[PDB]
Amino acid sequence: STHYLAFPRASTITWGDDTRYWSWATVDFSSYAIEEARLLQVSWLDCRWSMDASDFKQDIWYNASVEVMLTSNASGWNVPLHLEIELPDGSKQESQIVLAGRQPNVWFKIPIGKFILRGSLTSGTIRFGFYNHEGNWKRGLNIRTLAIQA
Amino acid sequence: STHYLAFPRASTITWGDDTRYWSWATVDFSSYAIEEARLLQVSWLDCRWSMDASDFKQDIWYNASVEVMLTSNASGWNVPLHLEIELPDGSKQESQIVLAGRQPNVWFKIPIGKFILRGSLTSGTIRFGFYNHEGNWKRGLNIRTLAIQA
C-alpha cells in the first residue's frame, strides 16, 4: 500500500534545468497535473529525492520504487544503473539494474531498496536515488514518480 | 504542478484503527494500490500528516490541498472544518470550510494553506491537517490524499 508519491520536480536531477539534456512535460495523474522528467541525453545521470525519516512510521518495513519509461530514442542502458537509499546514519541500501534488456514506451517500476526505522534512524534525512556516471551517453529515459509503500 | 502525494495511511487519524468509527478500502490510483480512509462516524475528527521542511525547496510558494468525498450517509457537516499548516517555528496557517453545502459521491479538493520556506524554516517538521472536535457526529467522509503543489 503506497504511502507517498514523490514526483521528479521534488527531486534534484543533475542538468535537470538544462534543456539541452532534459525536458519537462505536464501530464494528468489521476486528478493532478504532474511533470515527467524526460532525459534526452547525458553522460552524468543522477536523480535524488530527500525526505525525512520522521515522515514515516517507525518499526515498519518500507520499500521504495521508481516508475520510468524508455523512449523510442533509448540507448546507453547496457551499463549498471545504481539504485540507492541512504539512511540518516549514513548507511545505505545499494543495488543495480541493467535497462538495456527492457522494451520501450512501457511504464515499469524499479525497486530501489527497503528500510525500517528504529531508534536513532527515526528522524533525519533519507535519500532515494539512482545514477550512472560513466562516460557513455544515456538517452531516452522518462521518470514518472518515486513511490514509497509499506 | 504536484510535487508530493501523501495518502492517509501515512497520516495520523484519531480513531483510525477503530473499525467502529473508520474503515479502510484498497483502490487503484494510477499504477498504485492505495487505501482510502472512510469515516463512518466520530465526534472527534482529526487527520494530520507530518513531513519535514527539508523535503521541499526553499524560497518557493507551495500550496496544499486534501482530496475528499462525502458519502451517501454524510451528515454533521454544518460545522466549520478546521484546516491547518504548522511550520517548524510553531507558526500556523489556519482557515475553515463548511462541507454541509457540498454534494456527495464526488471527489473535491479542499485548499488548506500556502507556505514558503526561508532561513530557519527550511528544516524541521511541517504538519498538514484538518479537524473538528465539536460534540456532534461527523459521518461519511472518505479521504483520498494530501497533495502539495508549487
Q: With helix as H, strand as E and coil as C, how does B58-118 read?
A: CCCCEEEEEEEEEEEEEECCCCCEEEEEECCCCCEEEEEECCCCCCCCCCEEEEEEEECCC
Whether residue A55 contacts residue A4, with contact meaning beta carbons closer than 8 Å, is answered with yes
CB-CB under 8 Å, B5 with A4: yes
Q: How many CA atoms lie within 13 A of B108 on its CB side?
A: 13
Domain around A80: 2-149
B16: closest CA of chain A, how far (Å):
15
Q: Which residues of A touch B34 (CB under 8 A)?
A: 1-2
Write the residue in A4, A125, A149 that is nearest to B6 by C-beta: A4
Write the residue in A7, A52, A150 that is nearest to B3 by C-beta: A7
Whether residue A97 contacts residue A37, with contact meaning beta carbons closer than 8 Å, is answered with no
Resolution of the coordinates, Å: 1.9
The separation between the first and the last C-alpha atoms of chain B, rounded to the nearest angstrom, is: 6
Q: Solving technique for this entry?
A: X-ray
- Tally C-beta pairs within 8 A across A and B: 82
User: What are residue B105's phi and psi, to 5 degrees?
Assistant: 70, 25
CB-CB under 8 Å, A3 with B2: no
CATH number, position A133: 2.60.120.260
Q: How many CA atoms lie within 13 A of B75 on its CB side?
A: 4
CB-CB under 8 Å, B5 with A32: yes
Q: Which residues contact B36 (CB under 8 A, 6 or more apart)?
A: B8, B24, B25, B27, B142, B143, B144
User: Alpha-carbon distance B126 to B134, whole Å?
Assistant: 25
Backbone breaks in chain A (C–N > 2.5 Å) follow which residues?
A: none
Nearest residue to B43 (alpha-carbon basis) of B130, B128, B110, B131: B131
Whether residue A87 contacts residue A53, with contact meaning beta carbons closer than 8 Å, is answered with yes
Q: Could you write out the DSSP letters of every residue in A71-88?
A: EEEEE--SSPEEEEEE-T
Burial environment of residue B147 by CB neighbours within 10 A (0 to 12, 13 to 18, 19 or more)? buried
CB-CB under 8 Å, B51 with A50: no
Residue A142 corresponds to which amino acid?
Answer: N
How far lies A103's CA from each of A14, A37, A109, B68, in Å?
25, 19, 13, 37
A33: enclosing H helix or E strand: strand A32-39
Task: Decide the pairing of beta strands A92-97 and A81-86.
Answer: antiparallel
User: What are residue A119's phi and psi, to 5 degrees?
Assistant: 55, -130
CB-CB under 8 Å, A30 with B29: yes
CB-CB under 8 Å, A34 with B2: yes
Q: Which residues of B touch A106 (CB under 8 A)?
A: none
Q: Which residues of B touch A58 (CB under 8 A)?
A: none
A140: closest CA of chain B, how far (Å):
21
Number of structural domains (chain B) is 1
A104: closest CA of chain B, how far (Å):
17
